[PDB]
Design a binder for this molecule. Structure first.
Ligand SMILES: [Mg+2]
Ligand SMILES: [Mg+2]
Ligand SMILES: [Mg+2]
Ligand SMILES: [Mg+2]
Ligand SMILES: [Mg+2]
Ligand SMILES: [Mg+2]
Ligand code: NA
Ligand code: NA
Lengths: 244, 244
RNA sequence: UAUGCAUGCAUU
RNA sequence: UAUGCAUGCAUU
């Protein structure tokens, strides 16, 4: 528990709505319209791991399409805010932004052309999830990838939703997450043939949904897309090393 | 690591106690077609710390039969004396298991198990006297040896021929015998459950026959690990976890 | 996010 | 025996 008081959450909603105006949810890069993403060379992944305050934020850059790690920054940080659903960015985003800036100063040539974020983008209680939030503050193209369904605007992990997951039969299969507004907030994606629990993909910034879904699918060796998976693995391994 | 002084004293103690091993049935329930009269099955296990070579947690459970509900638990932090050396497991875990037995007699003498499943081999052992025999001779309780991987002794090998046989195990309860180079039947490979492929290696501990030990092990398997051993392992690791 | 359980692989 | 990875479930 130890949730922030309502007055703090209310300020945070205001900041989310203001920055939401800067979200670009269409494609803005030439590689995004290419059938094989020709010209996409560098994909980023971000994640924060915790000690069972002390955390480890990690940014990786992977080559495309080989998905090999060409840059890694794993940093020990002291997080301030607690996890509250719908306010993830207020916990993780200042440190992720700080990693991007560190990359710009150390290997600016490895700046990623797109970033996969461990959390939703517009599939979010106010249409402005951590993936949008990182995208607006860095102006990088960002994809939101979530591991379970954020239940917003009528979306629910109920029987009907579970029935659709049964229709996902092969790697790459999708179905749209249709809000009560008639808006398509994201896609359920089956990562590969040997996984049944879908990923929940939504636009972060400067990318379209169908391109974000197709790209996430291409990063999936395992259920978790390789940029996120490598940041998660390396950040947790970094904690273990400086034993905790 | 122990000096050779201790090592030879250990080969000697094992041969000395081997003379008391009874590898036939001595309890009326063992001859019963449905094990009528068997009411209490024990399981023993010790968990270790990743950090401490010294600290360990030994646990003993007693389960009702045939419901397999835990009716007794004793979990104890202990100071290990010997390191793990293959073939001498008892000299590392068995003094603490004997102490758990003695404590049960003093606390709940009515829940004294009629048989004990041991996480480790019985007569399937470099000197025909594994930890399960060792506990059986020191307590005079009937004991079953259950191993999760094959102790390669007397020509037994986890080679291509052995792996073919494992493929021949098709359902829960399927078995094949483990024949040493002497032609002696040291144990049985048992498919524990329909939804596991990895066999158990079951051998006689004390005061039971192999056919009965195999059939009882199978009857205790909710999952791949027999429920008495499985419950001791879970409870002993949880105890280490909550003291870390 | 961390942890537990299940099934398998690897290391030991 | 502990850890890591994989797949699923649960708690959060
Ligand atoms: Mg994360
Ligand atoms: Mg993570
Ligand atoms: Mg054990
Ligand atoms: Mg164990
Ligand atoms: Mg995690
Ligand atoms: Mg273990
Ligand atoms: Na390319
Ligand atoms: Na009974």
């Amino acid at each position: 528990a130890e949730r922030p008081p309502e007055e703090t959450l209310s300020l945070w909603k205001g900041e989310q709505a203001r920055l939401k105006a800067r979200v670009v949810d269409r494609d803005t890069e030439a590689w995004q319209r290419d059938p094989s993403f020709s010209g996409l060379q560098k994909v980023g992944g971000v994640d924060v791991s915790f000690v069972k305050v002390r955390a480890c934020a990690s940014l990786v850059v992977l080559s495309y399409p080989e998905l090999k790690v060409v840059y890694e920054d794993s940093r020990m940080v002291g997080l301030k805010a607690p996890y509250v659903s719908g306010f993830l960015a207020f916990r993780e985003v200042p440190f992720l932004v700080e990693l991007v800036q560190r990359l710009q100063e150390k290997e600016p040539d490895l700046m990623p052309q797109v970033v996969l974020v461990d959390g939703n983008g517009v599939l979010h209680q106010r249409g402005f999830g951590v993936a949008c939030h990182l995208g607006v503050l860095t102006e990088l193209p960002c994809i939101g990838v979530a591991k379970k369904l954020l239940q917003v605007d009528g979306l629910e992990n109920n029987a009907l939703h579970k029935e659709k997951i049964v229709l996902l039969q092969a790697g790459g299969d999708t179905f749209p997450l249709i809000g009560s507004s008639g808006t398509v907030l994201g896609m359920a994606l089956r990562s590969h043939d040997h996984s049944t629990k879908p990923l929940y993909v939504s636009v972060g910034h400067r990318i379209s949904l169908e391109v974000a879904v197709r790209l996430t699918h291409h990063c999936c060796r395992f259920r978790i897309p390789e940029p996120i998976r490598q940041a998660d693995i390396r950040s947790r391994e970094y904690i273990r090393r400086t034993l905790g």
